Design a protein around this ligand. Structure first.
Ligand SMILES: Cc1cccc(C)c1OCC(=O)N[C@@H](Cc1ccccc1)[C@@H](O)C[C@H](Cc1ccccc1)NC(=O)[C@H](C(C)C)N1CCCNC1=O
Lengths: 99, 99
């Protein structure tokens, strides 16, 4: 679909079998989700954005469906204020900016 | 134009007589630019990122040219590591997400 930006581009996602609301974020290199339980091994990582750094758990090769489009890639889980879908997954669903 | 998301969507902007590189960020409600000396009145503001908040100066009705597309609105200025073009200005240049 074509999504205007008068409101936050929030969409429903499905990960680990659970439905969530997440932000399509072209300003994010990575995908970071709020604290949750995901199966599989993880590695402790840290990312620094505006405001400082946070500790996250990196899950690789995680299935995630974004607005009906499937993706498999790296998902970070930690104390992020909002579920963020980053460019690593936005590219997989064929997302582009257009004006 | 159409901008893929394989790399950071960075584009050239013109503000206050200066040319700069800025990030088209659908995950940013507002626009925040690296520290610069804009004239006129301003109001303090704090904006939240992934790691916390930073203090910025809010300037209203500031003209910015984004890829040749003009826009006028609120521009925040503060210790941001990256120039960020937010939804308040992306809407003005007719920017959409498409997949
Ligand atoms: C939310 C908001 C409100 C008002 C004004 C502004 C500018 C606002 O946006 C501020 C903001 O940080 N939004 C982020 C997502 C957001 C929305 C709401 C709350 C919190 C965050 C995201 O889109 C932009 C921001 C840019 C950035 C900053 C420093 C270093 C690198 C990149 N990108 C990142 O932080 C990403 C994270 C998300 C994986 N990130 C950090 C690891 C390095 N690379 C990278 O890409």
């Amino acid at each position: 679909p074509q999504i205007t930006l008068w409101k936050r581009p929030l969409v429903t996602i499905k990960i680990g079998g659970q439905l969530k609301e997440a932000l399509l974020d072209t300003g994010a290199d990575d995908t970071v989700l709020e604290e949750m339980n995901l199966p599989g091994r993880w590695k402790p990582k840290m990312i620094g954005g505006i405001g400082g750094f946070i500790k996250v758990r990196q899950y690789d090769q995680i299935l995630i469906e974004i607005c009906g489009h499937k993706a498999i890639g790296t998902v970070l889980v930690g104390p992020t204020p909002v579920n963020i879908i980053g460019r690593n997954l936005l590219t997989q669903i064929g997302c582009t900016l257009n004006f």
